[PDB]
Homo-oligomer: A and B are copies of this chain.
Amino acid sequence: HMDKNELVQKAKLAEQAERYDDMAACMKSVTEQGAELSNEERNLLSVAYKNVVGARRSAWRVVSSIEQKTEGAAAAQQMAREYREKIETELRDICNDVLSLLEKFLIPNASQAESKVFYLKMKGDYYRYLAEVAAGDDKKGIVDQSQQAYQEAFEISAAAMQPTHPIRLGLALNFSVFYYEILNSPEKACSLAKTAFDEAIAELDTLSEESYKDSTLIMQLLRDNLTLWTGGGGRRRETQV
């Protein structure tokens, strides 16, 4: 059995090799050893599972579009439907894997506000991924679970973290996307993103260069979504005194 250092070293090797199943298995093993993850181990775990589920999400959108495009061909549409359902099962199993890890190991032992916000955001993300493909009688509960987790994360970070903190900015980005795509609520999605951006830009100048670089990267994403969602109108071009 590998100790923690060997598992982290192997997860980094697997990352460079783009072997994300291996990477996630290593970081799940690290997690279940029961010690609080460091910032870099948190990033390795989250990057690994995002890529693992990300392959299915992309494949799911492709096959869904083919299923919609072949509506006049029974055999072709049925084959695409069955293949989408197969991908969905994989996707749900990955989400349930992550959600179980968050509930059983990560969230209960998060002793600092930063890490708890990170894991509650992650819980919001993976219920959101479930909500992207939920289409039966469980969608309503899943959508609510996502919003509850995001909101709990928002509550802790609003009180414990500066608005420039990358975790708080990343939470605002994804929670905004949840409102836009899952709830079909563009006005709330935009005001949430705009508020987090405005609150950060007021303090951005006070950061060290390295922290500034980190914050600005996420603030770029908030800006890009706002511009995408509001088009040429709404946003007024900027000039400088």
Q: Which residues of A contact B (CB under 8 A)?
A: 2, 6, 9-10, 13-14, 16-19, 55, 58-59, 62-63, 66, 75-76, 79-80, 83, 87
Contact = CB atoms under 8 A, between A and B. Distances in A.
Nearest to A73: B9
Nearest to A87: B17
B18 A79 contact: no
16 contacts: A2-B79, A6-B75, A6-B76, A13-B63, A13-B66, A13-B79, A13-B80, A13-B83, A16-B62, A16-B66, A17-B58, A17-B59, A17-B63, A18-B58, A18-B59, A19-B59
B17 A62 contact: yes
A9 B79 contact: yes
Given A59-B19, A66-B16, A83 B6 contact: no
The majority secondary structure among interface residues of chain A is helix
A83 B10 contact: yes
A63 B14 CA distance: 8
A198 B158 CA distance: 70
B59 A10 contact: no
Nearest to A13: B83
A87 B76 CA distance: 36
Q: Which of A16, A19, A55, A75: most chain B CB closer than 10 A?
A: A19
A14 B55 CA distance: 12
Nearest to A17: B59
A213 to B, nearest CB: 26
A87 B19 CA distance: 10
Contacts of A9: 76, 79
A113 to B, nearest CB: 34
A9 B17 CA distance: 31
Contacts of A79: 2, 6, 9-10, 13
A117 B59 CA distance: 34
A240 B14 CA distance: 43
A241 to B, nearest CB: 38
A18 B63 CA distance: 10
A48 to B, nearest CB: 15
A80 B43 CA distance: 21
Nearest to A90: B19
A9 B63 CA distance: 12
